[PDB]
Amino acid sequence: FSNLAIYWGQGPNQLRLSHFCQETSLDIINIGFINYFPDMSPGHWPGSNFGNQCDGSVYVTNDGVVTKLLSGCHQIMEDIPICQAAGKKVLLSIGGAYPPDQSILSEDSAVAFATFLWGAFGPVAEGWEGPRPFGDVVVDGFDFDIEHNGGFGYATMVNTFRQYFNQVPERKFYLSAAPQCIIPDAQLSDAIFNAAFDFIWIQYYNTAACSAKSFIDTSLGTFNFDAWVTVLKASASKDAKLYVGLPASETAANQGYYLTPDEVESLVSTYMDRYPDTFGGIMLWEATASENNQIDGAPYADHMKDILLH
Ligand SMILES: CC(=O)Nc1nnc(S(N)(=O)=O)s1
């Protein structure tokens, strides 16, 4: 079967992560966001935000400098294991919408960024004397939701993560990317060409030229999933599965990009049929919008899984 991914962490008044860990239909949950990068953040540690989650406390560096990395995410720490017990993959997402001034400035800081995240969030290692924001929890991988400021250093980060993954062959870890629909994508086409992602979720909303809506109304633009299949072929991500990223309600993205379940089926059955090896499934922005959009007594994400399984 194909997979259903969804982001969580940035939903206004979102329910805690375990609620979605309890939702059968979800296969992958991207937790957003590591939103502050080491080159420009306080203390030069990565920083995090998970909306209404965590108690507000932050770590400080060895020299007393206040960071933006949250240290009291009790609920998330408790909930991730529930997701993984139910068979789900939990990916920690890097970037997100806010703030808009974060980037990577050198290959060195790229390596060091991924090293830091691997130590903080990957396997517990005796040689690590740094922060463990989710304690003994080990995430299943990293998602690159780079929304601003170009594509420097993300390839190096992915390559560094892979190297670290390969030193733990008894466990599988995953790398993913969320480019927008226009090729080249200013943030992620470089990483996609130069480094290997397992999953790539194209955000099929907010860009008129190629949106999922233009599949339904072809006067709007041209849905370009075919082009994304072609562009993988020269890339180091040539074996990536491609997912159709969609808004989970009317108000989750810009006006006019939401599709009804029936509209999604028409798109998905066409493309699932056309690319049975490359089509990975659906990505949803995002969990709260899905949960609040109840259709026939079930949230949007459940109807998305129906379409993928039917
Ligand atoms: C993966 C993903 O979609 N990330 C997003 N970040 N901001 C979005 S928004 N508010 O412009 O619709 S979507």
Residue numbers in the entry: 28 to 337
Sentences from the paper on this structure:
A. fumigatus chitinase A1 (AfChiA1) also belongs to the class of plant-type chitinases family, and has been cloned and characterised recently. Because of the inherent rigidity of chitin, fungi need to partially hydrolyse the chitin layer for cell division and morphogenesis, which is carried out by family 18 chitinases.
Electron density for the ligand acetazolamide can be seen in both molecules in the asymmetric unit, but it is less clear in chain A, where the active site is partially occluded by a symmetry-related protein molecule. Thus the further discussion of the structure will focus on chain B only, which is less impacted and has a more accessible active site. The overall binding mode of the ligand to AfChiA1 is essentially identical to that observed for ScCTS1. The acetamido group enters, and essentially fills, the small AfChiA1 active site pocket formed by Tyr238, Gln230, Met310, Ala205, Tyr34 and Asp172. It is oriented by two hydrogen bonds, one from its amide to the side chain of Asp172 and one from the Tyr232 side chain hydroxyl to its carbonyl oxygen. The sulfonamide group on the other hand forms few direct interactions with the protein: it accepts a poor hydrogen bond from the Trp312 side chain and otherwise points away from the protein and into the bulk solvent. Kinetin failed to show any discernable effect against AfChiA1 even at concentrations in excess of 1 mM; acetazolamide on the other hand inhibited AfChiA1 with an IC50 of 164 μM, which is an order of magnitude less potent than previously demonstrated against ScCTS1 but not dissimilar to the level of inhibition observed for allosamidin.
